[PDB]
């Protein structure tokens, strides 16, 4: 599958001035556009080489739309302060994420449009793209407004139309990277932690996309006890890193296997010391 996602964050500044607004666009795990209210350009900016070929009409259009998004969030911070009976003195946060997935058939798979206030679910479009999940009575007020304004119908048209069409355009224009899988480069390290115990660390480096599974087995059965698994982390060059470690009795390293699952691997890899 492939995804296009836009992420918006607006943080109010009660001391002085307007909210800090940051928008980022992704195709899969690749950032391709950004807007930051604090940046000099006041434009939607490219962050991937394959979006740079889009002409001036594209950049003017996306700049106009992302500035309109920022004003909507500014108004929403005011509305939500009202709904929750909060003072003008505190900083608050609105977050929005929307976008679309295409499946193995390159057709529309799913759409989403999710909103949060102060880091908690507020309102979300259901998978049917016809109904809303409102977390509380403030969000229920928004749900009634959005039902009357036919927001779900407008979003459904975008998510099943423009969103998937432009995702497919970007995937073709950027295919050299976006449709390339980078299989993890895997190795094991060995460190004594005592006279009687050793740590085996299974590394997965320079992989894309970010989704990966590292599992330890002992004599061919999954082991979670005496293991540590770090959160997948960005390398900073567009690829990802992860490791998993197990503590084992010194001399028994040969019993342990690290199993690596990734879209870039025809069959999962097995590593043994």
């Amino acid at each position: 599958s492939h995804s296009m996602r836009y992420f918006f964050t607006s943080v109010s500044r009660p001391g002085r001035g307007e909210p800090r607004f940051i928008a980022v666009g992704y195709v899969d795990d690749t950032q391709f556009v950004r807007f930051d209210s604090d940046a000099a350009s006041q434009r939607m900016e490219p962050r991937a080489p394959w979006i740079e070929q889009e002409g001036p009409e594209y950049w003017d259009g996306e700049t106009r739309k992302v500035k309109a998004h920022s004003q909507t969030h500014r108004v929403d911070l005011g509305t939500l302060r009202g709904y929750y009976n909060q003072s003008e003195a505190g900083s608050h946060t609105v977050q929005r994420m929307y976008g679309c997935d295409v499946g193995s058939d390159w057709r529309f798979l799913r759409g989403y449009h999710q909103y949060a206030y102060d880091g908690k679910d507020y309102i979300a479009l259901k998978e049917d793209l016809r109904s809303w999940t409102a977390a509380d009575m403030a969000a229920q007020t928004t749900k009634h407004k959005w039902e009357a304004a036919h927001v779900a119908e407008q979003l459904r048209a975008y998510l099943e139309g423009t969103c998937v069409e432009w995702l497919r355009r970007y995937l073709e224009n950027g295919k050299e990277t976006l449709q390339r899988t980078d299989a993890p480069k895997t190795h094991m390290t060995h460190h004594a932690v005592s006279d009687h115990e050793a740590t085996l660390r299974c590394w997965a480096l320079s992989f894309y996309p970010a989704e990966i599974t590292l599992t330890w087995q002992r004599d061919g059965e999954d082991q979670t006890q005496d293991t540590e698994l770090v959160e997948t982390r960005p390398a900073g060059d567009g690829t990802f890193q992860k490791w998993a470690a197990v503590v084992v009795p010194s001399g028994q390293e040969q019993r342990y296997t690290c199993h690596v699952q990734h879209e870039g691997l025809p069959k999962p890899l097995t590593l043994r010391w």
Binding site: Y6, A149, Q154
Partner: peptide, 10 residues
């Protein structure tokens, strides 16, 4: 490509 229809406020 961003949503073109103006966003409806909460």
């Amino acid at each position: 490509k961003l949503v073109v229809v103006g966003a409806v406020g909460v």
